[PDB]
Nucleic acid binder design. Sequence first.
DNA 1: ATCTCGAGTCTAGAAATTCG
DNA 2: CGAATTTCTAGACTCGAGATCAG
Lengths: 261, 261, 261, 183
Amino acid sequence: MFEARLVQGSILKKVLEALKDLINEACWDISSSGVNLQSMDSSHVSLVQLTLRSEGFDTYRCDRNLAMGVNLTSMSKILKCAGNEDIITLRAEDNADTLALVFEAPNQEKVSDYEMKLMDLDVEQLGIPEQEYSCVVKMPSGEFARICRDLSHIGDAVVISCAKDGVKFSASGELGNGNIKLSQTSNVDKEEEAVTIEMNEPVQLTFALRYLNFFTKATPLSSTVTLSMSADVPLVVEYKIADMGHLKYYLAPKIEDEEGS
Amino acid sequence: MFEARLVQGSILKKVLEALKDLINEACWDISSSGVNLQSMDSSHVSLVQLTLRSEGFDTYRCDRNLAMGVNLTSMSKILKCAGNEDIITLRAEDNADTLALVFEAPNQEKVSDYEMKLMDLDVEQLGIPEQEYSCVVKMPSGEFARICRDLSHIGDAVVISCAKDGVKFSASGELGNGNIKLSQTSNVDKEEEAVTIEMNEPVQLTFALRYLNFFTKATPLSSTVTLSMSADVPLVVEYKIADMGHLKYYLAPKIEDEEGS
Amino acid sequence: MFEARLVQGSILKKVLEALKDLINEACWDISSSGVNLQSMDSSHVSLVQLTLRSEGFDTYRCDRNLAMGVNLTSMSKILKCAGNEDIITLRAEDNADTLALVFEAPNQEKVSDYEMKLMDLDVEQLGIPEQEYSCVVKMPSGEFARICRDLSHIGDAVVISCAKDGVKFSASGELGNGNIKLSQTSNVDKEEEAVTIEMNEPVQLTFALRYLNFFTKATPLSSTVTLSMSADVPLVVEYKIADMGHLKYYLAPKIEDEEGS
Amino acid sequence: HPYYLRSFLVVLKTVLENEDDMLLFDEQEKGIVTKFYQLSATGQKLYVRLFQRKLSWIKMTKLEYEEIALDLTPVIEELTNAGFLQTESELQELSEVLELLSAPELKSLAKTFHLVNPNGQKQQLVDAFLKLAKQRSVCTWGKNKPGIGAVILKRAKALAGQSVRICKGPRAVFSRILLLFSL
DNA sequence: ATCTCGAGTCTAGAAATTCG
DNA sequence: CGAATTTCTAGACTCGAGATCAG
């Protein structure tokens, strides 16, 4: 029987909000290591991964590895009902088909108990080979969200072309063409304002802006996006879930020949 | 000649906001003791009442008993145009079909004079028979509103179990079922925190959640909401309008056989 | 070539927000004196004037007079993407083919570059005359916006009449008739929170509420709005653009039909 | 005579000719067709069209038959008293009224009664409305028997307006002749 | 050949969350 | 704590889907 007690319900609320508009069914792989997820999107373009180490949960216990097919929209709707400071207590028992969420108010005056209905999903595993990237940038999440939102109004395909002084989030469209450019900073006391870029080889790619706008819904999770890209390799957008895990988004770069026609 | 000078316009604004989304027309009964509204709902299942007393009004004068049919939507639209610090001065001439609203200002530099066209309504007199109630529950209005809003997502019917260990709501739908329970308050002396429950006989009923959501629109009126119900009698939801009166709602419990279909 | 460096981008943002819902295409008569814009609206009922003196800009260089016919909706769309603390650097080459915007940031760490496609338009210059006015009223912009918004809920015919001690805005719809009177006060030291009326002869006019609601979109530009009118002369609504220039709105009075007969 | 009528009159003529046809019909079955004959040319043609249409309620505003009469109301009364037609006065079933209403009209009624999904399809609204008639009421009408569906009926009938339907009696009896012609 | 209809699709305005 | 913002929702728009038909 599986029981997890997470003190910070805001983390789960934000995760479910981030995943609600991109994935509808997921295969929650639960092991002794911790909660895991891997389910490429319904449009079959973008891949999403999630990890939650067991050390993060205040109380964790699991005997046998499981596999839960949960409707993400229903889970998001259920989690929206929970408050911002409750203690989520996910629990599944034996071989039932019910997910039992329990929310406890901090003042022990209101205990909410909810129950779900599991569904069977085919366990499809997609290989994730580790490799080395060319352009790796660590930069504030709010800046990335603002850049994507601003460029969504002009065009629909950014051209990330990491340059000598910094990134070059250019675009194009019928209205015109916006060439945004942040300047590299190193002498910053805090790490929330670092825009450090590490290069080995030059890079220049193309991506769909709708998928980037979908990706940036996970801004509240952290404040340091870690865009890592290289030649003919899917882009990796990674956030740090406090000290619990990471939420990586995979997006294959668009083909320049597609824009020709 | 009717002339009522009410210093707090916010009370009237809140009352009209509460009554605007549930009621279209009402019989604005007036007398020498204060406004006594008693109107209907279109679906013919919920009954509302209002008992604005006379001592609360700063100045009151009423020569003869009057009955007015005022379009509630129109009155709500007119009241929305007034700020939350004006001095409403409802006044109606004898058989003139005009409800001359007058809004003053705290800085006496801008006054507003309005007029409305009265309507002819078939005054149906209903005599509410007073009766004893088994379960009497009073709790903060915010908690009740949040509970109803949370349970609206899951299902549509709420099974209130007025148990002596703590009121326990329950709703079951296609997405699952979720039950929320509270606990009695013993040490908190604040009136906006007590969850005191009164018992004479255990009860268990079922009501439509849409009507409860409509009822909870009067939350800003007062912090404490009183619930009274018994076996096979309508539920009474009562809000106290300061020292000026009260606002009661009525709802017909669902039949158990209705859930069979 | 034309280059204008404006420290306060919020002024341009507010101006474009004001002009976006009333005028679609306009001609910017650029000269050494400053920026000019006269363009009757699409419905050909109201006229909009604008002037920004060259001394207002931090840096200004205009060798020759041009006429940039640009799309107002697209300009508003681009300008919305800029922050409220940027340093806009509108630029255009002597070969009039494109408009460049060089949005910056206060931290000189992120710059934005944009381009636009100009259009060729028939510059129909209308020479407005300079006439005196009978009733001139200056009063806070917030009060005017609130009055227009409140009256829009009743009818579509405002009957202004400078009464003995202030204005007498009067609407008359099917629901009722609402009279609003402002008390003339001048003893207040704060001239922003003052209403001053100067009479030369009595006047009573009529106007359309939709156009007044459209006009009131320029509220954040300035706190005080000046109204001037006379017999059979269009109403003048003037907003002072800080210390740079002014933004005038024109509206021909409604023709009072022989409804009494 | 309009084209559909003479071919229609042919059916009655030959059937009334052969002596074996009326042997399966009783006296009142021969009397109802007799009442058809004594109807006027205007009255007879009106019953022709509604025979070929599906058996359902039809709004009065939806018949535009300029070839017979610009104003059909005097003609409808002629069939109304004869028993060939029935008017909305006999329309008492809730289900019949709800399907009679148009798609946008039903949506407006749903908004007034605060339905769960006011912007659903026509079929989902009808069952919800029919289900709503089974709910209880409050002291608003006392409590002897809910009868809330009666409240819906009066509101729905006013929305629907005037309507008529072919009476089954004349319909069933008159449907019994055209088939034996096909043999 | 004639006709109505309902159903999916897209905007602009009202309401809830948040930042200042 | 009001204004601005984003998001959710009512309303109008365009088009596929019945119903009838004539032989």
